[PDB]
Amino acid sequence: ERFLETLAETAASVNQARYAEYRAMYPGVNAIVGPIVYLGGGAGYRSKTFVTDQ
RNA sequence: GAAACUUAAAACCGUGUUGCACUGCAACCCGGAAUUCUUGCACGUCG
């Protein structure tokens, strides 16, 4: 329950650490900070794991 | 006084249901408690 009250916070902290720096490598893509999550197929290998190093 | 079987013959027998009437019967819950439950992205990879 205490985790669910800070759910938009951990969704933003996992956004800046997992795929904000990977998204900024490819040109023409503008980085958003967001409470961003990923859902469903076609989302990539990075969204369905917890591996850190490239 | 010594000498001559109150003897012989004759089933205590014949006939006759230990028989007649009578419910091993009346009353009684195989009943009371219990989640087919616990974990699991129809998804990953592109000369």
Question: Is the C-beta of residue A13 closer than 7 Å to nucleic acid chain B?
Answer: no
CA distances from A27 to A3, A24, A31, A40 (A): 35, 7, 11, 25
List CB contacts of A8: < 8 A, sequence separation 6 or more: A35
Q: Could you tell me how many helices (H) and strands (E) chain A has, helices first? A: 3, 0
Give residue A15's identity as a one-letter amino acid code: N
Helix/strand/coil for A50: coil
- Token couple for A11: 């969704």
Distance A23 CA to B18 C1' (A): 124
Instruction: Say which experimental method was used.
Output: cryo-EM
Structural contact between residues A38 and A20, judged by C-beta atoms closer than 8 angstroms: no
CA A42 to chain centre: 15
- Which nt is closest to the CA of A45, judged by C1'? B44
Closest residue to B43 (CA to C1') is: A41
Helix/strand/coil for A6: coil
Give the closest residue to A33 by CA, choosing from A43, A47, A19, A53: A19
- Residue count of chain A: 54
